[PDB]
A paper describes a structure:
Apo-MytiLec crystallised in space-group P21, and diffracted to 1.1 Å resolution. The lack of an obvious search model led us to determine phases using a heavy atom derivative, which was aided by the strong diffraction of the physically robust crystals. Two monomers of MytiLec are found in the asymmetric unit, and the model shows expected geometrical features and has no Ramachandran outliers. Several N-terminal residues remaining from the thrombin-cleavable tag are also present in the apo-MytiLec electron density map, so that chain numbering of the apo structure starts at -1 or -3. Least-squares fitting the Cα atoms of residues 1 to 149 of each chain in the apo-MytiLec model gives a rmsd of 0.27 Å. Overlaying 37 central Cα atoms of individual sub-domains from within the same chain gives rmsd values no higher than 0.6 Å, indicating a high degree of internal symmetry. Two adjacent phenylalanine residues, Phe 93 and Phe 94, sit opposite their symmetry mates at the dimer interface. MytiLec was originally reported to be a monomer in solution on the basis of gel filtration but analytical ultracentrifugation confirms the protein is a tightly-bound dimer, and mutation of Phe 93 and Phe 94 blocks dimerisation. In order to observe any changes in the protein on ligand binding, both the apo and GalNAc complex structures were determined. Both the apo crystal and the co-crystal with ligand were cryo-protected immediately prior to flash-cooling by soaking in mother liquor containing 25% glycerol.
MytiLec, a lectin isolated from the Mediterranean mussel Mytilus galloprovincialis, was identified through a study of marine organisms and their adaptation to different habitats and environmental systems, and shown to bind α-D-galactose and N-acetyl-α-D-galactosamine (α-GalNAc).
Residue numbers in the entry:
A (entry chain B): -3 to 149
B (entry chain A): -1 to 149
Write the structure that this text describes.
Amino acid sequence: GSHMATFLIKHKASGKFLHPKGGSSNPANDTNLVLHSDIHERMYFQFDVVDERWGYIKHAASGKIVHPLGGKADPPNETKLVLHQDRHDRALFAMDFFNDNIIHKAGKYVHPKGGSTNPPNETLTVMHGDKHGAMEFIFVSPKNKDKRVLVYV
Amino acid sequence: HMATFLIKHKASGKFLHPKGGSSNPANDTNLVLHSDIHERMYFQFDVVDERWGYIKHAASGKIVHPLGGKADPPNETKLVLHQDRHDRALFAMDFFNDNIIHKAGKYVHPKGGSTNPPNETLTVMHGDKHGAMEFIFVSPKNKDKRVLVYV
């Protein structure tokens, strides 16, 4: 809904964060989502709850949301994650704050491309069905990157 | 308009109730499993700290406690309703793994661990994880529709 938490999406193994590539306040449609160590307001996210666990991962600065590129119902492994303005069911994710992962409605997870525990800055993110330590994410305060915050509001 | 929901034992389809089904259960009333549905078995969840909060009997405002209110209760500790609020009554509603976890790490179980507990079976804390300790949180008007308990 319109009341949302504002948080950082932190890759647990590396300590890096989800960013729009380039860090714009208003990324173009289909801008890749990457991992990067910087912290600033143009990498803050919100979670827009739609249907129980399901909702949109919203870029706070622009209002664009996370999508598997191309808007397929069941994206294959290695489908890149991007930002896009469209709001529809194929952009639904759940923020699993118990198992520490981000799961798409068709069942794959958000990963760093290549699956490293310690990826470099600018590493792309993709959908992949595998579960392992390098696909874990926690959701933390913009003012304290170690403090978990509740994203279901 | 806080979330109001049924706590459904996944394996059996029975629900969490105050023993006796009252709108006004006394302090230390046991929490049981039972198949009946009514407004006196609706629950709410009051968030305290991120994942942690109080599981609340909607009709009375009583919350779930380990009997005796200890921080780190042993296996088989009965679960009861009580009006007091304190940090030993904190639980998280894990709607991903489908369980209810206390702050010290044990889970809500049917006493005995059955996949098909009879009506009136007591609930307890126990550290084990298995299919008969799974619970889902559903709409009073549609017991198959999961609802978000955090809002």
